[PDB]
């Protein structure tokens, strides 16, 4: 469904496939994306949904599941 956006974009931003990401893991260390890569991921998510996410809320996406939690 609409989550297909996130679970797609994440992979396109991290080089992993759609099913590679696990909800329990964390982007910062368990996916290999460093600070710059995570900034790029969150900002691409911002672009895709034509919305805005301030720094404080944006910093709360270190886990895989959060990417949908703030979305839906």
């Amino acid at each position: 469904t609409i989550e297909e956006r996130v679970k797609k974009i994440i992979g396109e931003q991290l080089g992993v496939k759609q099913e590679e990401v696990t909800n329990n893991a964390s982007f910062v260390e368990d996916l290999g994306a460093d600070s710059l890569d995570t900034v790029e991921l969150v900002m691409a998510l911002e672009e895709e949904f034509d919305t805005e996410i301030p720094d404080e809320e944006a910093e709360k996406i270190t886990t895989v599941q959060a990417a949908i939690d703030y979305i839906n």
Binding site: E12, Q13, G15, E40, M43, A44, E46, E47
Partner: peptide, 17 residues
């Protein structure tokens, strides 16, 4: 600027693959 960034990463992915 934001479109520039995302489009650039799409290619970085392939090269580093």
């Amino acid at each position: 600027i934001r479109e520039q960034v995302v489009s650039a990463k799409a290619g970085w992915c392939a090269v580093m693959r």
